[PDB]
Design a protein around this ligand. Sequence first.
Ligand SMILES: Nc1nc2c(ncn2[C@@H]2O[C@H](COP(=O)(O)OP(=O)(O)O)[C@@H](OP(=O)(O)OP(=O)(O)O)[C@H]2O)c(=O)[nH]1
Length: 299
Amino acid sequence: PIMRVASIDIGSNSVRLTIAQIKDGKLSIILERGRITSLGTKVKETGRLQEDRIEETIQVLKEYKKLIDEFKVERVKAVATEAIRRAKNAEEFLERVKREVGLVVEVITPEQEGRYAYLAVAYSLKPEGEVCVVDQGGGSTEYVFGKGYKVREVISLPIGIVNLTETFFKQDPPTEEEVKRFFEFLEKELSKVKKPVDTIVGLGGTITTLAALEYNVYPYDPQKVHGKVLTYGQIKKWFDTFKEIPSEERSKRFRQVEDRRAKVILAGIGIFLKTLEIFEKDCLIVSDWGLREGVLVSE
Ligand SMILES: Nc1nc2c(ncn2[C@@H]2O[C@H](COP(=O)(O)OP(=O)(O)O)[C@@H](OP(=O)(O)OP(=O)(O)O)[C@H]2O)c(=O)[nH]1
């Protein structure tokens, strides 16, 4: 009676696989693989998908389906960033994947991904009352409102940690004024999503890094993190810490901080901070499950 499923997310830089199955009522992850192909390389400036990248990605996709079929998972979905939509060869690519790897890839919007992530949260955390999943990412953050497995509304804010960090922070670490204009802005933009909620669930690399931080979880374990709480205080404690030091010292002194995140992580912490303010809340619940797991959730 056991049914196994798998999901494959083709990101702008990574490709991920996740096969799982359902006993009676429980769903569990049996494997998680991921490889960097950087399929998104120079897409914006060239309006093209580099052939070698496409080549590298396709090989991995096959490498992946080898496992899918292996576990004979009778249900497989594959999605891709819409970022690749700016490439003329985007459809051509999608085509090749179809016959060369025998795989149907659905490009999805930043809102759709929000919807998927939200679903992963409804199953892994079973939130109560009105819930708002806040998925802060590198390109942008999505606020997803709903009840149970029902999605009310999804709003996607252009507030990408990278550009947001390039704009307001001109020094590493930044100056007090900079941090101030940063929050004025955050305020303006965030007041737009303000809605009455009961439980705010936190998502993304920044906030799970923050949990590991707060709970002294070094070798990353997604059980000592998932479902953990993060009061406004614990969060403000760490914003304060980092703000006082340059991206590098954060990387050096704190093992859970990925060099790639080390810098931008300030603004990321900021968003979560100001959000609790606007939504007037003392804390939020952190989730290790997101898009990749949310896709599987759908059945
Ligand atoms: N370890 C590692 N991870 C990488 C690297 N590059 C990207 N990632 C992770 O993979 C996702 C971003 O790239 P993709 O896989 O292409 O996904 P995407 O195009 O939809 O953004 C994010 O995972 P995420 O945490 O689920 O989303 P996020 O909130 O950080 O954005 C990001 O942190 C890398 O070089 N090393």
